[PDB]
Amino acid sequence: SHIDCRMSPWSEWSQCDPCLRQMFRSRSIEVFGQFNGKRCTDAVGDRRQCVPTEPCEDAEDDCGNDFQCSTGRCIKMRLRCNGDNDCGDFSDEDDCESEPRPPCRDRVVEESELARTAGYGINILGMDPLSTPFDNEFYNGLCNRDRDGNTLTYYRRPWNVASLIYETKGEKNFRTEHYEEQIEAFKTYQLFLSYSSKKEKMFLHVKGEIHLGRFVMRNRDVVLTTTFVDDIKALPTTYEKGEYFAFLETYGTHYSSSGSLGGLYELIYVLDKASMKRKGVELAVNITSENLIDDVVSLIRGGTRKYAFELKEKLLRGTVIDVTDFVNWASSINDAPVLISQKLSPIYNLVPVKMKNAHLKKQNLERAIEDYINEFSVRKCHTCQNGGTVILMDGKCLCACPFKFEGIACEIS
Amino acid sequence: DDCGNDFQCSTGRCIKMRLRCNGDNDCGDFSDEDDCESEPRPPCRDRVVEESELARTAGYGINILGMDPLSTPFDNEFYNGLCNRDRDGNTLTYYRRPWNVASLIYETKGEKNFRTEHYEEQIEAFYSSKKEKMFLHVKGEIHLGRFVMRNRDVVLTTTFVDDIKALPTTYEKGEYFAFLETYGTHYSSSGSLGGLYELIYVLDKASMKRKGVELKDIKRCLGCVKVNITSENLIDDVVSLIRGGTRKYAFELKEKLLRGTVIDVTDFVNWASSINDAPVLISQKLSPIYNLVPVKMKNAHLKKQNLERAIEDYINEFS
Ligand SMILES: *[C@@H]1O[C@H](CO)[C@@H](O)[C@H](O)[C@H]1NC(C)=O
Ligand SMILES: *[C@@H]1O[C@H](CO)[C@@H](O)[C@H](O)[C@H]1NC(C)=O
Ligand SMILES: *[C@@H]1O[C@H](CO)[C@@H](O)[C@H](O)[C@@H]1O
Ligand SMILES: [Ca+2]
Ligand SMILES: [Ca+2]
């Protein structure tokens, strides 16, 4: 029969966290739902208000002679007045009635529209990008002007983006592979048998990888977003799974410590086709089968709307593609890049030392991320039949099979 | 309630003192922005930005058992006085991100498929058996951007928390079902803005293929001499599902299909250009709405526990 969402009992509640003015509760997921039963939508934990059972400790975490900004954030005095968006929000106008001097002197430099997005959060579940933990509109008083980028225009590189180098690389891989076959035979009162069979196989693989450089994030002196540091300040300090999962679900299990920008296209045709016949009379019989799979798939990512969706389908069809259609799509990757692949750093590496209780939060995050990877596992689900495998999705385990066996568990043929 | 040193709001909210003067509608109908005209200090230092129409509707309510208002309990007019921004690579326009939405990533990611599997078998002796299974699929995705939204520090519409302050402490099933349809049964904590199609050909190929068309020719005519297939009555049984875009281009694609004719590649790109106006959600990750009920609510855990007792009854209220 079909399969429903299931969970443990809830655990015993927390004490009241005196400065956070809340209490916390949590529960384990045990079945997601499957085979089109009752799909999960169900939470890992819950929180309740309390008048706290003890005093809160002194909140302020002041860095000293550094300027304490209107954000959660400290900054060094060379950046108190710098003609720039220092310290994570504008916080300076009442001081900077003098000393306007910019990082870039007499110049007109623009922001790198790639570097602002560098250091995506990533969730290891599905490997979706999330907006940066990193500030990337902070420049540390450095001008650090790059003339780089294929559109021959200068930009200012933001402090956390240690490298952004436009290594252009364009690759195409193409493979075709056919094997094609036929076998046939033949052999008052009379006898005969006639036999024939034919097989056709094609595998095409194509991929085109187009780079727009690579970013490497800085491994010391990282300046983080006001929202992220605040979302680390507002933590239980006691390993409440559901509350830590709420931070993973807004900034990722990892961040891309370095990532490769650009675009990709990929195409497959697989065709695998067979027909078999026998006929005979012996002093009538006539016995046949046909088996075909035909599956063509196209992926395009990166570039602008028009060119990508043109090229996506032109390439899927029989069409002999115009080189200038490729040039347009591949040029538009300048305007609209996508993250091709990247190196992942566990997110707790961005819990800054020189914040209160930092190392306790890190060991909690390290445990919590391990739990977040465990109770979302596929290994708990019931088995697929025949040649399929257990796919995982939010609130369902399932399988599907382009192989003449059928249903949401591939059980029938 | 009192907001301490910060400002108390009409229809019930607390706005941090630095927000009030900024231009950002912090307390609804610009009622934050009674006189501060000596210090009207903006969130953005004269930088050009236009508000994100895709994301202003993000965080739609959804119900498995009689569909929800497709509307936001979240207040996507709120920005915490930040200027943080995501931009359209297609028109090179910057948008502010509503502070509910933890991430916008505009990601041009088209995918497409065409597929058939077919089996036939016959055994005959003048025991016997005969079998068919056949289909043709065309499937497509158009993807405009990911959204993901907060699980804490959420700022709701005042009209949503009002609809919690009006709930009784008791289970009151009729009133709790009124709320659970007034805003939603569940919310997408994340989703995928775009458009989608599925155009299954229920046509068994032999229905035409006994007349002068080959398998490679009918595939050629779909995406041809050997008959005039576009003139002929022969193509009939094609389904249409089509999600998002401007109704003209959705109609043109449907009209061509119900006429038994192929859509031109010109058409699909025209449709894909129009998903910028009128997006739909291709997939969603779901949580029940009680997770939005603020921890400050005067019987908060009791109301949330009764919303769980109410959500549980919808599954029995319908077959
Ligand atoms: C028998 O022969 C006919 C004529 O070629 C063929 O169409 C059919 O598939 C064969 N199989 C049967 C009738 O079992
Ligand atoms: C096939 O018939 C249609 C009318 O249904 C006609 O417009 C078309 O010209 C014929 N063949 C061609 C040229 O497509
Ligand atoms: C944990 O589950 C218990 C059921 O034993 C409830 O009382 C509570 O609301 C929480 O969900
Ligand atoms: Ca300054
Ligand atoms: Ca305001």
From Swiss-Prot, chain A:
Changing F192C: Creates an artifactual disulfide bond that prevents the conformation change required for oligomerization and pore formation. Residues 4-57 form the TSP type-1 domain. Pfam families: Ldl_recept_a (PF00057), MACPF (PF01823), TSP_1 (PF00090). Residues 100-380 form the MACPF domain. SUPFAM superfamilies: Growth factor receptor domain, LDL receptor-like module, TSP-1 type 1 repeat. It is found in: Secreted; Target cell membrane. Residues 61-98 form the LDL-receptor class A domain. Plasma (at protein level). Residues 381-411 form the EGF-like domain. Changing R48Q: Slightly reduced inhibition by the antibody aE11. InterPro entries: Growth_fac_rcpt_cys_sf (IPR009030), LDL_receptor-like_sf (IPR036055), LDLR_class-A_CS (IPR023415), LDrepeatLR_classA_rpt (IPR002172), MAC_perforin (IPR001862), MACPF (IPR020864), MACPF_CS (IPR020863), TSP1_rpt (IPR000884). It is a multi-pass membrane protein. GO terms for cellular component: blood microparticle; extracellular exosome; extracellular region; extracellular space; membrane attack complex; other organism cell membrane; plasma membrane. Keywords: Age-related macular degeneration, Complement alternate pathway, Complement pathway, Cytolysis, Disease variant, Disulfide bond, EGF-like domain, Glycoprotein, Immunity, Innate immunity, Membrane, Membrane attack complex, Phosphoprotein, Secreted, Signal, Target cell membrane, Target membrane, Transmembrane, Transmembrane beta strand. Glycans are attached at W10, W13, N286. Thrombin cleaves factor C9 to produce C9a and C9b. Phosphorylation sites are present in the extracellular medium. GO terms for biological process: cell killing; complement activation; complement activation, alternative pathway; complement activation, classical pathway; killing of cells of another organism; positive regulation of immune response; protein homooligomerization. Membrane attack complex (MAC) assembly is inhibited by CD59, thereby protecting self-cells from damage during complement activation. CD59 acts by preventing incorporation of the multiple copies of C9 required for complete formation of the osmolytic pore. MAC assembly is also inhibited by clusterin (CLU) chaperones that inhibit polymerization of C9. Specifically inhibited by the antibody aE11, thereby inhibiting MAC assembly. CDD domains: LDLa (cd00112). Disulfide bonds join C5-C40, C16-C50, C19-C56, C63-C74, C69-C87, C81-C96, C104-C143, C381-C397, C384-C399, C401-C410. Belongs to the complement C6/C7/C8/C9 family. Homooligomer; about 20 C9 chains oligomerize to give rise to a huge beta-barrel that forms a 100 Angstrom diameter pore in target membranes. Component of the membrane attack complex (MAC), composed of complement C5b, C6, C7, C8A, C8B, C8G and multiple copies of the pore-forming subunit C9. Pore-forming component of the membrane attack complex (MAC), a multiprotein complex activated by the complement cascade, which inserts into a target cell membrane and forms a pore, leading to target cell membrane rupture and cell lysis. The MAC is initiated by proteolytic cleavage of C5 into complement C5b in response to the classical, alternative, lectin and GZMK complement pathways. The complement pathways consist in a cascade of proteins that leads to phagocytosis and breakdown of pathogens and signaling that strengthens the adaptive immune system. It is linked to Complement component 9 deficiency: A rare defect of the complement classical pathway associated with susceptibility to severe recurrent infections predominantly by Neisseria gonorrhoeae or Neisseria meningitidis. Some patients may develop dermatomyositis. Macular degeneration, age-related, 15: A form of age-related macular degeneration, a multifactorial eye disease and the most common cause of irreversible vision loss in the developed world. In most patients, the disease is manifest as ophthalmoscopically visible yellowish accumulations of protein and lipid that lie beneath the retinal pigment epithelium and within an elastin-containing structure known as Bruch membrane. This is Complement component C9. It comes from Homo sapiens. The lineage of its organism: Eukaryota, Metazoa, Chordata, Craniata, Vertebrata. The gene is C9.
